[PDB]
Amino acid sequence: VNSFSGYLKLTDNVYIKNADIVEEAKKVKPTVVVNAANVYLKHGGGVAGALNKATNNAMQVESDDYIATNGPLKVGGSCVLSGHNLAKHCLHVVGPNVNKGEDIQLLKSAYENFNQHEVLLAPLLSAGIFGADPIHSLRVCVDTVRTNVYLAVFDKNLYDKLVSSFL
Ligand SMILES: O=C(Nc1ccc(C(=O)NCc2c(C(=O)O)oc3ccccc23)cc1)NC1CC1
């Protein structure tokens, strides 16, 4: 028994709620919150900017030191850094960006990173396909992640189509 509340059971290990992950992070203080990062860990907008803003830019300061030491992540890769005031840990995961010509097939490799953590609060990845084929992103999560994932979905048009499609 964990502390996630109001999430709907989608599958054996996947749960889903209509909410802003940042606001959910401010609440539960989970062991792991997932960030939909870019390979430079430049947290300008979206989940990254919203998470980073909620940390008063401490996430960005830590991230810049990480990149200066290690260089950029791979698309489909991840790193574990501090969760700051939002979680014990933040798993920064890079999904492919179709807007930059990156290959959507890398989405499965991105979700595989979740399997290194028993329980995670996470968003859907590759938001660049959210108008073209939003269902594609959630199908991969369910078919790839075997650990317990609590998905916080921001868009209500989306959540309704998603839960409808998988029930
Ligand atoms: O900006 C924020 N939050 C914030 C910002 C951005 C997101 C986000 O990239 N989600 C991913 C997503 C969603 C959804 O979540 O609807 O659907 C999808 C379909 C396909 C692929 C991906 C997705 C999530 C949360 N907060 C600030 C104003 C206070």
Domain chopping of the chain, boundaries:
8-163
Coil vs helix vs strand at 2: coil
Tokens 């209509």 found at: 18
C-alpha 124 – ligand 1 centre gap (Å): 7
Q: After which residues is the chain broken (C to N over 2.5 A)?
A: none
CB 31 within 8 A of CB 87: yes
CA 4 to chain centre: 16
Residue 100 has φ and ψ, to the nearest 5°, of -105, 15
Task: Give dist(CA 34, CA 39) in Å, integer.
Answer: 14
Structure tokens at 75: 């698309």
Q: Give the method of determination.
A: X-ray
Coil vs helix vs strand at 74: coil
- The residues, any chain, with a CB within 8 Å of residue 151's CB and separated by 6 or more, are 7, 10, 14, 15, 16, 17, 122, 123, 124, 138, 141
Q: Give the resolution to one decimal, in Å.
A: 1.0
Task: Give dist(CA 60, CA 50) in Å, integer.
Answer: 11
Q: In terms of DSSP H, where are the helices of the chain? A: 21-28, 46-54, 58-70, 107-112, 134-144, 156-166
Give the CA angle between residues 72, 78, 79 to the nearest 5°.
80
Q: Which residues have CB under 6 Å of ligand 1?
A: 20-22, 36, 46-47, 50, 123-124, 126-127, 129-130, 134, 137, 153-155, 158
Which residue, among 154, 111, 149, 157, has the nearest Cα to 10 in the 3D structure? 149
Identify the residue whose C-alpha is closest to ligand 1 atom 21: 127
1.10.3720.10, 3.40.220.10, 1.10.1740.10, 3.40.50.460: which CATH number matches 8-163? 3.40.220.10
For strand 32-36 and strand 78-82, is the pairing parallel, antiparallel, or unpaired?
unpaired
CB 157 within 8 A of CB 21: no
Which residue, among 81, 113, 87, 83, has the nearest Cα to 3 in the 3D structure? 87
CB 97 within 8 A of CB 128: yes
